[PDB]
Structures are given as C-alpha cells and as structure tokens.
Design a protein around this ligand. Structure first.
Ligand SMILES: Nc1ncnc2c1ncn2[C@@H]1O[C@H](COP(=O)(O)OP(=O)(O)O)[C@@H](O)[C@H]1O
Ligand code: BEF
Ligand SMILES: [Mg+2]
Lengths: 174, 27, 635
C-alpha cells in the first residue's frame, strides 16, 4: 500500500450513483418521467441515443434543495470529471432498462437481433445454473449470488444498443 | 465448500486439503 | 509519499489517546522525569508506553482487530500518533514506540502452537528463555567528516528486522569517500548505534509435553527491551510474528520466522530466578502501617504463615523472621557480615516439615526448591559448563537464589561431597569457581532452609542428639536455628491434630460445588478483599490473607533498615554469655555464630515491627526463639 498511496477526495461515487438513479427515475418536468419514457423508446428500438440534459440535472438539484432534502452537486461533479460519469450513467441506465413491447419482426437491424440473442442466452445460462444448484440441495438471494459468481455471461457492455451523450448547460439558465 | 458456505450463510476460503485414509494392502 | 489511510489511522489513534487520558498522563510523567533528571545533572526513562488492548477494543473494534491481525499496517500509524502527541505535549523544547498488554484471544500462544497460520500477526508467546546473545550494537546512522571541505556527512541505514513494513531493499554500503571524491573519516561518538539482542524462547517445562523434544522460537529485542531477561527466566514476549528472507525461492528450505519484540514480561514461577514483586497501593501501605502498631503483630503474622499446619508456632515465627531476614553489613576493609538466617528442621516423618518448605517456596518473593541428591554439588552453587560456543559459567540453584530462599528438602540424604560445597555459600555468601583457568566469585546471598529426618528414622531420646543428627559440627554451626521436632503420641495433642486435619479436608472453595473437582491453576505471576481472611482451619486470632502477608514482607524488607541500640546490645551480650558459659546439653554447639544469629534475629523482629531501631523486646523475643531451639524452654 506504500507503492500506491491514497487520497481522500470530496466526491463519493456511491452517493452520486444513488442521485443519478433517483434523477433518472423521478424527473417529470419536461405525464410520465422524461428519461423513463426515453428509455422505453430505446427499448422498442426507436431511439439509439440518450441525451442527458444537464439543465434537467440542475433543475432536479434545485427542486431537491428547495424542498430541503440534501442533494449533492451532480452537475459540478459531471463537469469536473465527465468521463467517469459517462459510465456511471450508462450502468444506471442499464439497471433501469425496461423491456420491449414490440418484438423482432424480420425487419430489425442485425445488431438488435444479435443483442437479443446474447441477452436470452445469458439469461438461459443464469437460470440453468440456478436450477442445477437448487437441485443439488446442499434463501434465493444467496443462490442468485453464487450463480452470478459461477457463470460467464455476456457482459452488459455487449448488450447495449443506445449511445450516451451529455448536453451542456444553457448559458441563460445558468 | 464455497457453495455450501454461501448457501449456509443465510440464517475467501483457501484451497482445501485432501486427506486419504485407506485400508488396502500395505507395502 | 503521504498516504490518506495512514493519516486516517493516525487520527483515529490520536482520538483513542485523547479518550483514555491515562496514556497521556503517563507520557507526561515520562517527559517530566527525563527533564528533571536532565536538570538535576544540569536514569533517563525510555520512550515507551503501554496500551491496554482491552481499552482499545472497547474504544474501536476495527482498530483493535487491525492491530491484532494486521499489525504491519496498524502499528506504525499508532506509533506516529503517539510521537505527535508527545511532541505537542512537550511544550518544553527518536520516535516513541508502543507496547501492548491485555487479552490477545486466540493469538496467545506457546512456541509449540506457533504455526505459520499466525504469521504477520501480533502474538503473545510464553516460555522459558534459554539463549541470550550478547548485546551487539547496530549501526543505524554513520556520520563522516570531510577534511578538505570541513563538513560532516551522514547516511542512514536500515534492515528487514527494523521495519514492520517491507521497505524496498536498498543495499547499504559504507560511504568511503565524498561525492567530490575527498577522503572521508568515520566519526564515532556522533554516529548513532542502537542495541540488538537475539533471545530464544523455549516452551516451559511446566507445560511442555513430557518425553518429547522441545520447540524454540527466536525473538529479536532492540533498544530499551535488550538485557531485560536472563537465561532460565519465564517470559511473556508479545510481538509481531514476522517472517523474513527470500524463503529459498530466489535462485541461490522454508522461510525464516522470528518475533519482533514489542514487550518483554519476565514471569514469576515457583523455583525460578524471577522475583515476585507486587504493587503497593496507598490503601495497602496504610493498612500495613496501622496493623504494625499492634503489640501482638508478631503472633498475628506468625499464625498466618501455615494456618493449615497445627502448632509449630515457634517454627512459623522462625520462618517469618527468615522471610524478613536481617541486614547484611559491609565494612570499609572489605569484610562482609552475613545478614541472612538459616533454619534447619530435623524430626520424625509426617511432621509437616516438607509442607512448611513447600509453603516457603510458595510465599517468598524469590525461592528455589531442591531435593536431597537431585541437585548435586554441581547443581547447587555453580560450575563451568565448558560450552563449545567458550567455557561459559552456569549459575546453579544458590546463585539463582540471590537475595532469596533455598528450600532444600531431605537434607540428610545429601551426599557428603555435596554438603562440602555448601559451607561457603552458607557463611561467606559467595561461590568461588577457581576452575579450568576461570577465577570468579559469584554472589550468592541466599537464606537456606532444610528439612531432614534423623538417621534412625525417629528421633531417639535415649541417644544423644549428636548421634541422631549425624551432621558435621560445622554445618550445624552454620545453621542459625536447629529445630528438633518429634511425633509424640499424646491423646489431647493428637485429637487436636485430627480435629484440625478434618476441618482442613472439609473445605469447599467459594466458586465451587460439592462434588466439583478442584481445577489446577498454573498461576504464572508477572514480575512488576479485606486484609483479614474469614476462613480459618484453626479456631480466636485475626489471620491475614497470604497475598497481604506477601505485601507486608515486601514493604518491610525495602523500607525499614533497623540499627542496633545499646539497650538491645546489653541483652544480646548477656544472653550470649549465659549460653556459652552454662552447660545444659544444648542441641547445637554454641559459638560466635550464636551471637551473630541473636543479632540477626533481633534485627528481623525490628523489621517486623517497622522500627528504625532494635529495641529490648526484639532482643527478648530472639533470645526466646534461640532458647526454644536449643533448650526447649518456652514462656
Ligand atoms: N501438625 C500438622 N498439622 C497439619 N497437617 C499435618 C501436621 N503434621 C503432618 N501433617 C500432614 O501430614 C502429611 C505429611 O506432611 P509432610 O510435610 O509430608 O511430612 P514430612 O515431615 O515427613 O516431610 C501432610 O499431608 C501434612 O498436611
Ligand atoms: F516422612 Be518426612 F517427608 F520427614
Ligand atoms: Mg519430607
């Protein structure tokens, strides 16, 4: 630990991950949540690009602070270190991705069918391993943990079709 | 052993050693 | 490069130190003592502190567990925290080091249980020291002087055993010449050398598996911890169980393992050289002072020596006086006058002589137990070992019992040759080797107590005592008090004995059931509730607890240095002359040793009364004891 020292920094990525997830789920200013609807459109293979409006994040922060709840400065953290927050947003989106309501109809892009095949295959592997370990008869949370540790899935990096981009703050609002 | 420990955790392990006890003919 | 986790642990330990102000107070005491000794001269007490691991575990379980199981990463932060606290505290214008005490749980081990799965952990090994390398100083920084430029240069040095963490191995070559190329001369006395000693701890024979070869582990002690113990001691060496070397993995069988020393605790065990000191609280000193005022203090103490044994009150008084001892006198010309009293018990079997010896072994601060012939003349005194690594000297029983007691049992079975070598130790209190080209005079200031049955099994009244004892006249002379006891068949006395024995055997320890077997306690005391005991096998005096008696003896021996008075001198002289010039077929020969033992017994009684001077009553009591020993008179 002496070769690679450590530094404490004001940023806490776990709290910011929670803030990102909450912002994605519960932003309504622009009926339903804006980004949830965008993710639904992505799932139906309509939109290939998710545009994270930083003005939305700023308004979310202002709403949270105005009501008194403490919300960390997500916009400033994004501006200071943008590269990491790309992957943070990408993983938060990948967790909250809904399921398609319109299946493959022989006219879908080959990328989409390959992604669907990979997703179904890794789900099948996970379920099969769960069934085997359950049948071994040695809570389902521990079973899920052991099967996800013991299986080699297609990583989530290879099952996402959308692209992630950030829109800078409008000068007039800021 | 890993499987059993994780399963029974509900209310890392080193490489286990095998001990072989036999009753066969002794040279 | 600064590390954040290091600073966090430092802050946590500073908070711990501020929480328990005892350590801060102790640091202040260390610093004020050093400053005072500096001011007195216009013993410097070492830069160390003791940390109660129990207190730390209460304060922060994470930090306690970290020190216990990950010491290389947790100890240096705590040491740095202590150093910073000392620097901040030392408002008045060499880092401090830690020492640990408390319960180590599963890490309290012995050199047999010290397996590799305890490596790199703080362990508390206990055993017997068997080898101590002579203290060889280690060079940590060398200061050099350059003649041409006229300036002093230094280089720091380090090795694996110095640092708990594995600093990057850098070759340490000696700076022969300066960067500009000028010649460099070493400047001793400016260079910093630190001490270094390797000691080997072996499993204690008291708990080693009988009949099997022992197991040993090396301990590297540095700085203040060196020369803390000697071979034959019992130690509790707590330290990090480091593992060193390449393990043979580097292309040149296992890894070399040793314990880096943090603390050394010499442990007192029966018949070992380590003395058993005790802490005297102000409450205890006050109790001792108050109890010393009573006129019957001698009787009260004497009754408490052996409550189990019925009677033998004069023997118990003599034993108590032995425990107090006398004052040894050293004169300008070099003559040394014995200040220790020796007691010999001769009597019928089952007279509780061995019981009294065992109690003396069990209650004295420093006592050594020997049998008749198991400890030969080589075993007693000392003799050259002729060790090949050359002609070392090994201290026998009596040398190891300096300022202590030797409890010899079955004195009659001793070889004549064995008892030849005991005369000098008895009288001159020295052991002269004068052997194999080694001329040495070891100091053996020991008090000898021995028990020995008469040659005819039971003491013979028809025969004279000279026939029964069969000991050389010189040996009997050297013994101050020669008690001749008997097993006399008397109805009243014997039935009282039976009453006492049956009372003793009907005892149930407070934390025990009826049929619950009594569990043996090793009781390895460490060399560093009421006064009276309610339980009494003999019923109505006030009997004191044995630990309180030990505290009383420890106080009296150190504090009080009695001196004779003319009033006591007249009584002693009269008694001595009466004994010498009156014939009453005394058990022992009467010589000037009788005068000397009268003086010593008076001094011992004076010490019991905590008197700065010897008074008339002490002389009378000593004369009464001597007359009881020789004539048998009792008033
Ligand atoms: N006066 C006594 N009071 C109490 N117990 C005694 C007395 N005399 C002998 N005993 C008991 O008798 C046993 C023999 O004592 P011991 O010291 O072994 O005798 P010896 O004098 O032969 O060495 C012990 O168990 C001891 O407790
Ligand atoms: F029978 Be005893 F140990 F003098
Ligand atoms: Mg005996």
């Amino acid at each position: 630990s002496a070769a690679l020292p450590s530094i404490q920094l004001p940023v806490d990525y776990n709290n910011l991950f929670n803030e990102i997830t909450d912002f994605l789920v519960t932003f309504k200013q622009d009926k339903g949540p804006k980004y949830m609807a965008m993710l639904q459109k992505v799932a139906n293979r309509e939109l290939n690009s998710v545009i994270i409006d930083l003005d939305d994040i700023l308004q979310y922060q202002n709403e949270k602070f105005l009501q008194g709840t403490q919300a960390d400065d997500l916009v400033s953290a994004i501006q200071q270190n943008a590269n990491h927050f790309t992957e943070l947003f990408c993983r938060a989106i990948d967790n909250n991705m809904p399921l398609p309501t319109k299946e493959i109809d022989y006219k879908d892009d080959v990328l989409d069918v390959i992604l669907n095949q990979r997703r179904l295959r890794n789900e099948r592997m996970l379920s099969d391993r769960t069934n085997e370990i359950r049948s071994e008869n040695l809570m389902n949370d521990a079973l899920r943990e052991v099967v996800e540790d013991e299986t080699e899935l297609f990583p989530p990096n290879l099952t996402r079709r959308y692209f992630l981009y950030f829109k800078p703050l409008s000068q007039n609002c800021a | 052993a890993k499987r059993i420990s994780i399963l029974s955790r509900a209310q890392s392990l080193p490489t286990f050693q095998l001990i072989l006890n036999s009753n066969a003919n002794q040279i | 490069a600064p590390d954040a986790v290091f600073g966090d642990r430092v802050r946590r330990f500073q908070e711990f130190l501020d929480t328990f102000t005892s350590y801060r107070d102790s640091v202040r005491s260390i610093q004020v003592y050093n400053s005072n000794n500096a001011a007195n001269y216009n013993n410097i007490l070492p830069h160390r502190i003791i940390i109660s691991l129990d207190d730390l575990r209460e304060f922060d379980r994470s930090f306690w567990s970290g020190i216990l199981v990950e010491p290389a990463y947790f100890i240096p932060p705590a040491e740095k925290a202590l150093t910073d606290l000392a620097d901040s505290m030392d408002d008045v214008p060499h880092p401090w080091k830690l020492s640990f005490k408390g319960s180590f749980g599963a890490h309290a081990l012995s050199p047999r249980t010290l397996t590799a799965q305890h490596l790199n952990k703080l362990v508390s090994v206990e055993g017997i020291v068997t080898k101590t390398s002579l203290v060889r100083p280690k060079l940590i920084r060398s200061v050099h002087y350059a003649a041409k430029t006229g300036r002093f240069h230094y280089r720091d040095y380090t090795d694996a055993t110095t640092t708990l963490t594995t600093r990057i191995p850098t070759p340490a070559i000696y700076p022969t010449e300066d960067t500009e190329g000028n010649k460099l001369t070493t400047e001793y006395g400016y260079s910093t050398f630190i001490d270094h000693q390797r000691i080997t701890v072996q499993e204690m024979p008291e708990m080693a598996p009988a009949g099997q070869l022992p197991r040993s582990i090396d301990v590297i002690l540095d700085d203040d911890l060196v020369d803390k113990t000697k071979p034959g001691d019992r130690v509790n060496v707590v330290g990090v169980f480091k593992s060193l070397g390449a393990g043979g993995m580097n292309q040149s069988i296992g890894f070399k393992t040793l314990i880096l020393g943090n603390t050394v605790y010499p442990l007192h065990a029966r018949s070992t050289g380590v003395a058993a000191r005790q802490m005297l609280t102000d409450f205890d000193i006050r109790n001792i002072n108050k109890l010393s005022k009573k006129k019957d203090i001698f009787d009260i103490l004497s009754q408490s020596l052996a409550p189990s044994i019925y009677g033998h009150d004069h023997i118990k008084k003599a034993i108590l006086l032995m425990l107090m001892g006398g004052v040894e006198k050293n004169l300008e010309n070099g003559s040394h006058l014995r200040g220790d009293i020796n007691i010999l018990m001769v009597g019928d079997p089952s007279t509780a002589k061995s019981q009294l010896l065992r109690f003396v072994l069990n209650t004295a601060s420093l006592a050594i137990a020997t049998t008749g012939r198991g400890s030969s003349g080589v075993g007693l005194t000392a003799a050259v070992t002729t060790d090949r690594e050359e002609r070392r000297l090994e201290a026998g029983a009596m040398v190891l019992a300096d300022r202590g007691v030797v409890c010899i049992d079955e004195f009659d079975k001793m070889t004549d040759v064995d008892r030849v070598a005991i005369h000098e130790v008895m009288e001159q209190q020295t052991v002269t080797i004068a052997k194999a080209g080694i001329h040495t005079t070891l100091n053996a200031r020991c008090s000898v107590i021995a028990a020995a049955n008469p040659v005819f099994g039971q003491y013979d009244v028809n025969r004279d005592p000279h026939q029964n004892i069969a000991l050389p006249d010189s040996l009997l002379s050297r013994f101050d008090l020669l008690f001749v006891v008997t097993d006399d068949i008397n109805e009243i006395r014997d039935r009282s004995i039976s009453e006492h024995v049956l009372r003793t055997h009907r005892y149930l320890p407070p934390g025990y059931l009826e049929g619950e077997p009594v569990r043996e306690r090793l009781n390895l005391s460490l060399a560093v509730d009421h006064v009276f005991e309610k339980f009494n096998p003999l019923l109505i005096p006030k009997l004191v607890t044995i630990p309180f008696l030990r505290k009383y003896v420890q106080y009296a021996k150190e504090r009080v240095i009695p001196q004779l008075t003319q009033e006591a001198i007249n009584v002693i002289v009269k008694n001595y002359t009466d004994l010498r010039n009156d014939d009453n077929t005394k058990k022992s020969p009467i010589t000037a040793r009788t005068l000397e033992t009268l003086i010593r017994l008076a001094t011992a009684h004076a010490k019991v009364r905590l008197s700065k001077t010897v008074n008339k009553v002490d002389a009378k009591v000593a004369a009464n004891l001597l007359r009881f020993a020789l004539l048998g008179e009792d008033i």
